Symmetry: T
Subunit: 161 residues, 12 copies
């Protein structure tokens, strides 16, 4: 027992309300992106339907894994996620996805914008998150990178060169 | 030969009532998915791990269900709406709480919301069946999968 | 507005004692089929031993998954399954599998007949089950179909020109 | 003491029922064959997606024909999936020879899927009246085929 | 030039040996059946864990009964796994009807596992005397069953 | 220095109408073999039903992969395959599979003969294919070999002492 | 305190020349069984060809894994296996597999007898092996059991009523 | 060779003794956590045994992967890990795990504390590690995050709300 | 017995011409792999995703091909050279552009380079076959795999 | 019927000697696992990679072995002690060095420690077998697996 | 109307062809057996790599012998893979008894591989003249064996 | 729409030319390492050939995954990778790999040096990359770590202690 600590209830790292609130911002935009991604996935029609249909599902998978990661990171640090529909709708920073069928070209533009807005949210909270907890900032880096890849893979469809 | 001669043979498309009925199922499946994840993250207390894990299985089922329903709508020329605003505005499920809840409370809350979702499907079933027997089979899969989840979750709180 | 329902104790579907009794009839014949299937699997000898030995295991697998499905369907709707040995022996409608070794030819006829009997039971309860709960009838259809396929794959050994 | 005593008689179907499944079988096989034809010969804008989706259509149609033929055998009917029979009795419009543009293939194949679904819907009630289990297999065929129709046709859809 | 010359005679076992394996077989089958009964009907605190563990018990017991019946056949004995025989000759206390609490299921099932192990231990030496290889299969059964007993009983254990 | 070629429209290998016609002959017999294989698979009854039923599916699988390979080889070299039902029926060299159920023994002889016929076709076109394009002849060798193996595995049921 | 042993060259278990000679007897009969199993697998014709052809490969697989196990057990205890063709032919106790094709019925009897002989060898060395090294006897039990199961699965083709 | 370096023995990045020593601290606490996790895994008894039994194994897997990663990171940077039992016991900062069977409730509390102490160690060395080698700090982030998740998944059992 | 008596039985080794011919195939396969990845990253426009993905399949094929050829050389006592300098200096493929290119342009460019690679193999085939029929079979696999890729890529740009 | 009538049928439990004997096996398996990893990380020199990899296979075997033994103890109502302090205090294996060691040295060191571990098991085997034949079978698996590892490792250093 | 009419005659091979495949078969089997012998008995520097590579050699040789024997059967020839025949008719130099050093095993096995390839190359043209498809199987054998020779021999190679 | 942004073409993060140029440096050295790794993999001969042969392939896999990641990161941020052979050769910082067969000992030394030079390149651009885009620096950390592990696993062969 020469180097053993004797404490009996050694506590874990707890997030400040500011940190919790910052992760909460990331969470709602990821959930909203997931819902908008499926909406697009179902309702996309026209030239190169299948590619975008499939790519959109891949986007949804990434955003769903991301939201779960963020929420669980909140839980680990004693924060309480709110991913309920009312909260997501009232607090998301993403512009609303339109109703009805939309062309591949329009879906490409719309979805790219909503991905970009989601990355924006993460980049906006990044420094405050990093300052409090360097480990959580790494999760943010993974999210930024995966989302920016999705953005590139989707937007390239509409590129005119 | 017995070969048909038409060049643009049309598919079966759904009445607006039919689309409407599938839309009802769609929003409650999505809401159940979002509430399931909320419960999955925020459940605490006795037998946490079992419920944490089972709630994830409920979410998996509800998500594939919602995707199935929306794609059923699309095949039949209907247009699903799974957006957050629409879901919050039109879901029939009682709202899930925002905060930590005990395993016992989560079991009771989630069972109710599963039952509410099954009820939506049971309420539209006959009108769906009358228009398209094939789509009713999809509804049967949802009822049974969800009723199974309800049993697997609720049994935690069952007395002797 | 809000379409959200108010009740905190929203009830699940309520199943009649007749419904439970009907699935119970299906349950015991599937369990009995599985037990007889293994008996045949172990005790078959003669021309084309290996094929029947193998097919009999596939039948057992289907029948085991079936009985579990039925029993869980009972539980979901607050019925209480009884798959105990005494009850299966006392209430199965299948003729008993004979003791000791049986020829491939005889095993073919016997097991085909036991599948016929098992399907007969499902057909006997079908209409009453479908009227009360169409979703459960769908599971019955899955059972009927898988079993009829097993009967075809087994019985065709004995069919001539 | 609940054990029945007799062979307890096996499975059988009316010749009308068998003929109804036979109608479904030939169109599934024709669809599979036309599907591969389209798969090989499609050219042009968004070739790859259609080439791939058409193979998924063929897979579904092949599994379907198996399911129907096996259902026929289970109930002691006897399927006919031979080339001569399929060509003589299929209700599907003939697939054209030669290469076809992606846009043309989309319209052609959507029609042939729809014709296949039509056949299933045509026999459905007569099949259901004799065997509700068989009807469920028809429901699975309708659903999978109508999904393929949606996934294929969406390429040409203007909004 | 070491090659033997005669059919060199096949495998066989005494009727006493076959009867000893038959005792093990019926209790494994009974255990499997009671296991599923428990699996379906357990309710209450920590339902899910027990529901899942009981299925793992059933898997082990089913594979075991196969192993024993196949061992019997390999040595030209003839197993009896029929419902009537299992019910008439099993040594396991009957599993009760109806739903049972997790705590009650834990105690009930632990006892039935222990009774199954008892049967294996009872015939072990007689089996070993005739065939040491068969005894090894019995050792595998004892070990897997005693592990299941530990994994199940631990739920009720107070320290 | 630079060994790099200058042309921007470097042409692929150019195949004669005779080459396409030769693979077309192979294509229709493989498709016909696959259709007859399924017919036999469904309609075989009698002693050793299960083994033949299973082996026939393996044959169908090989023949289906084969026909796809041949058709794609045609496309690669700008030939246009025709695998449509009418053409297969009108141009296959295989004797037609008889209607209705057939005994295991009869199915063995029939299907073995249809494999023999299919291999015969490949052998008939082989030399002309090999002279124009050795790479394609290699694929023919793969086909011949897999089919001969299928003939062995099926026909040996009927071979005596 | 310290229960740690002092020696730097702690010896492994030392096996008698008799032990090695005993496993060598097992080794050659397993290799011979594997070679005869393949011979039968290739050369069997007649009623139920496919089942026996398949089962014979499973036997070969078991016998090959067995011989490798035995040889490695020899190496672990500083015995030196000899699995060379000349030694196997000169020292195997199995009757030789006859040349040319054999009927399914004959192959059944022959191979069953060769399994019987292989198990006989293991039984002959068993007691001496168990007395010197119980761990090795356990591996012998695994071999005996797998082989007896193979004999059952093969021989039952020829058993009547 | 226009941009090619001409050096023949280009050396890799070498850890300072301070860096090596910091990784060594992480290593022993991860190994100790792994040993204590198994001790708990075997000896946990009572309400919700199975869940904790399984979750504890998942903790052990993570800590074992972690220790291997840390040790290999030391090796790559020319440091020499010491993961021997004597060293771990003499130098771990974790309080000793008690002997004997312990209740689920007590195991939950004990293990949470030891996870927290392990995270503490990593957080204590984090900044010094980051300053010398940003890449290694990322490995630390992965460890912190995985361990804090485990803490949450374990401790939630005892949460009273 | 029929057992041979030699202790150091030699393997078949290739002439310098044979090694040379395989070296030619090797550099064009490597160059095709590098150009395929360039195109994979930099393709933009209509039907991007399909081409992005197909180009990766081309790269996978060309890489396993180059590895096969080099290992064929090694087995026959020849020494492959797959280094960047050698590849740039000796490849027969027209250079791929540095920048973003449209899907239509990438289809045309890549088809040409695949065809150039097949041409190299077809040009060495007969001399390879004459020395070692077994190695020609490897060449056949490369020709057919690459010609398949050419078809799958080029079809995007095909008129009615 | 032949059904037994008791409600709380007891399982076989081990004597303290039996538990003690399994405890002896447990600590040497754990110590071997820790020493195996030490050797795995710190081995350097000729044929490093083979030994690095083989030592990991030894560790995998020893870990599943220790888990098996501890769970055997638990089933029989004995209480394992696998804690670091207990392992260091009671293991019979000679201590592994702290620093880099050559492949040749690591082969010799690890072979000795494997042999020491097998010896512990062989020393308790007969008393274990006498009380519980089923547990002796587990011991046989450990002896053979470890003796296999000893052969696979030691062979590196074997003369002509 | 292109359908042929007769059984259309089955596959067959000349006895010379069958004998040529028989030569390949025995050396593949001998190689497999010597391969395992080497695999078990190799000791010394870089033991593990050689132990593992030799097993990969055995796998290839076993699959090869299967391919050849099955080819023989497909064309209605009758293989002989029995121990007595292999030992009496193999062209491979005998593998020595006892443990051998890694360096010696490398040289020994490389020679036996080369001898096996020699046999395949020896019969190749005669086989090809009757059946070009069979020759392709021989090409696959040559290629896989020559790769194994390279992977094994490289251990002893000095540059 | 209470928190929803109203922007319609929200743009993504764009790399500066400096950032693009820095990733371009990493890219060419990874590609060059991949080509040199294969060259070594084919041409290594002598003592412990097989180990190095296999380890070199593992190095190539890692460097190939790395180059693809770097290039795709450039694409996501609107930079245009150049991985063409001419560019790689003209701009790589790695010393040339020699022609011809080389001993295991020489290959170990040569390859270790080229790995070290590749890590050097990444470490040289690290800070400038981190300053502009923290998320991309994490990808660099993964590359450094994986490469330094490979270096250790390769170089240890030649270590004399
Ligand atoms: Cl795709
Ligand atoms: Cl089979
Ligand atoms: Cl669980
Ligand atoms: Cl290796
Ligand atoms: Fe989660
Ligand atoms: Fe979808
Ligand atoms: Fe269940
Ligand atoms: Fe079928
Ligand atoms: Fe069994
Ligand atoms: Fe295709
Ligand atoms: Fe081995
Ligand atoms: Fe490691
Ligand atoms: Fe390679
Ligand atoms: Fe465990
Ligand atoms: Fe074979
Ligand atoms: Fe990529
Ligand atoms: Mg639990
Ligand atoms: Mg058979
Ligand atoms: Mg596309
Ligand atoms: Mg090595």
């Amino acid at each position: 027992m020469s180097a053993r600590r004797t404490e009996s209830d050694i506590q874990g790292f707890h997030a400040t309300p500011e940190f919790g609130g910052n992760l909460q911002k990331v969470l709602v935009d990821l959930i909203e992106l997931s819902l908008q991604g499926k909406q697009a996935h179902w309702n996309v029609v026209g030239s190169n339907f299948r590619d975008l249909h499939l790519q959109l599902d891949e986007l949804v998978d990434f955003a769903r894994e991301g939201s779960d990661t963020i929420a669980e990171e909140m839980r680990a640090l004693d924060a309480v996620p709110d991913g309920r529909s009312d909260t997501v709708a009232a607090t998301t920073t993403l512009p609303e996805f339109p109703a009805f069928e939309r062309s591949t070209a329009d879906v490409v533009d719309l979805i790219t914008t909503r991905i970009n807005a989601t990355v924006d949210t993460i980049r906006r909270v990044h420094d405050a998150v990093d300052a409090e907890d360097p480990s959580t900032a790494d999760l943010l880096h993974g999210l930024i990178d995966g989302l920016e890849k999705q953005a590139w893979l989707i937007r390239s469809e509409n590129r005119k060169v």
